[PDB]
Amino acid sequence: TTFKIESRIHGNLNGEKFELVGGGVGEEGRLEIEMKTKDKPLAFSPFLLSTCMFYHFASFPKGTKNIYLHAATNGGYTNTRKEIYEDGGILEVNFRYTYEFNKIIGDVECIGHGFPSQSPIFKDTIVKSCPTVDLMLPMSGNIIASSYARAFQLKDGSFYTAEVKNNIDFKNPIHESFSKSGPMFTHRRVEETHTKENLAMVEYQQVFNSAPRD
Amino acid sequence: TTFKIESRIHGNLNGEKFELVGGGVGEEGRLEIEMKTKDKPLAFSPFLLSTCMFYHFASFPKGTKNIYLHAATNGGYTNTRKEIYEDGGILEVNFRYTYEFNKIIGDVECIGHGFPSQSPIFKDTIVKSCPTVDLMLPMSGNIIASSYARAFQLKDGSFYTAEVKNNIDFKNPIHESFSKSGPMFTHRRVEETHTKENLAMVEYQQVFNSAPRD
Numbered sequence: 001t002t003f004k005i006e007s008r009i010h011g012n013l014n015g016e017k018f019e020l021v022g023g024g025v026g027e028e029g030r031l032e033i034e035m036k037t038k039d040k041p042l043a044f045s046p047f048l049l050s051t052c053m054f055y056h057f058a059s060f061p062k063g064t065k066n067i068y069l070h071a072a073t074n075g076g077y078t079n080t081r082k083e084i085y086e087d088g089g090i091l092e093v094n095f096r097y098t099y100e101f102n103k104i105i106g107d108v109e110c111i112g113h114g115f116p117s118q119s120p121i122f123k124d125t126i127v128k129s130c131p132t133v134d135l136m137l138p139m140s141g142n143i144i145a146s147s148y149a150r151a152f153q154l155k156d157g158s159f160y161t162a163e164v165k166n167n168i169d170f171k172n173p174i175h176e177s178f179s180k181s182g183p184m185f186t187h188r189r190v191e192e193t194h195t196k197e198n199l200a201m202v203e204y205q206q207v208f209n210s211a212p213r214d
Numbered sequence: 215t216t217f218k219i220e221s222r223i224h225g226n227l228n229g230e231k232f233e234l235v236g237g238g239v240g241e242e243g244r245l246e247i248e249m250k251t252k253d254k255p256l257a258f259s260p261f262l263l264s265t266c267m268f269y270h271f272a273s274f275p276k277g278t279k280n281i282y283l284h285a286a287t288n289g290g291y292t293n294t295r296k297e298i299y300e301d302g303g304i305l306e307v308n309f310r311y312t313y314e315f316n317k318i319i320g321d322v323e324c325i326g327h328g329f330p331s332q333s334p335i336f337k338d339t340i341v342k343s344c345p346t347v348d349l350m351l352p353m354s355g356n357i358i359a360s361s362y363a364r365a366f367q368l369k370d371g372s373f374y375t376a377e378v379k380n381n382i383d384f385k386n387p388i389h390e391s392f393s394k395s396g397p398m399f400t401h402r403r404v405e406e407t408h409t410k411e412n413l414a415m416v417e418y419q420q421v422f423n424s425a426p427r428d
């Protein structure tokens with residue numbers, strides 16, 4: 001069902017700190033969240049922060065339990081991400097969560113560096129984030145390593161791309177219904193409406209493990 | 215849509231040349247192919263050659279034309295792949311095709327290097343290729359750049375992984391029905407039955423551009 005979402009994103013990009021706070025709601029397969037910067041507007045494209053703005057809200061295939069919600073009741077998990085952009089920019093993000101009754105509170109530490117002055121994040125030319133399909137592999141030690149390529153679409157129609165990897169670290173064994181004989185995939189897409197002071201987004205996540213058609 | 219397939223794979227891995235010849239059949243969404251080595255058995259795991267063993271046989275979403283089959287009618291295309299394995303192994307592959315009435319003849323150049331002695335491909339511990347979901351981006355200059363992570367499952371249940379990138383070079387414009395405002399995805403899975411002398415497999419490919427569920 002539904003849960004309240006609360007989040008704080010803090011860190012710095014190329015040396016300048018920034019902070020956002022906000023929240024929203026999420027259900028199986030969909031979440032909406034709004035956040036606002038504190039003290040000043042972002043010095044870079046807010047689209048760079050869409051992925052920083054809750055794996056718990058994905059729909060799972062019949063037969064597989066939502067491992068993130070299960071973990072929330074069993075010690076939890078953290079996610080550590082690294083995004084490597086084609087122009088050398090690197091975004092490193094760490095996600096930590098605290099749970100309260102009917103509420104998930106995110107604490108996001110985001111460090112970006114190596115972004116050149118000519119980067120689209122400074123020209124403010126990104127107009128939207130394109131969908132992704134992530135590959136997830138359960139590995140020894142209660143870990144899931146995931147990987148996927150990502151693209152932002154720019155004003156002129158060309159793309160600004162990145163290679164992303166995530167290491168989801170669970171406190172306790174990942175639910176047994178999540179098969180360990182192969183990987184699963186997560187399709188993600190967002191609908192963004194941002195300014196350098198107020199970020200708003202709707203996100204749809206779907207975990208699947210078979211071709212879409214027969 | 216049943217076409218005859220023929221192929222020849224030639225190259226070398228860590229300095230030793232190898233060659234395979236064979237063929238099979240393909241249709242929208244499915245292909246089957248068998249090949250045998252020439253002169254000697256493979257000096258490494260045959261599973262490393264599954265991906266070397268025809269994008270034309272993918273099923274496309276309603277409203278989008280099969281761009282590979284269309285290209286076959288207007289100048290063609292080539293594909294250049296690079297697979298980077300987690301242990302340093304690098305597989306570089308170039309795909310070229312020639313068309314006859316109802317037949318596609320592939321000529322594949324496969325160069326592998328940097329694989330350490332302890333690699334699963336020499337221990338022969340790979341038991342199967344896991345499914346993948348590729349992200350495809352049309353770029354300027356009649357090109358499609360694709361990327362995805364790939365995994366082999368080993369005898370003990372653990373995985374041997376690689377990051378893969380592909381550059382599909384079309385002689386002429388990619389069919390217009392293939393939207394350029396965003397990426398499309400291709401889910402691929404294979405069923406393998408290999409020996410170091412005879413390789414056989416069935417492959418299912420499905421292009422899609424929306425979440426698998428509502």
Ligand SMILES: [Cl-]
Pocket residue numbers: 229230231
């Ligand atoms: Cl040789």
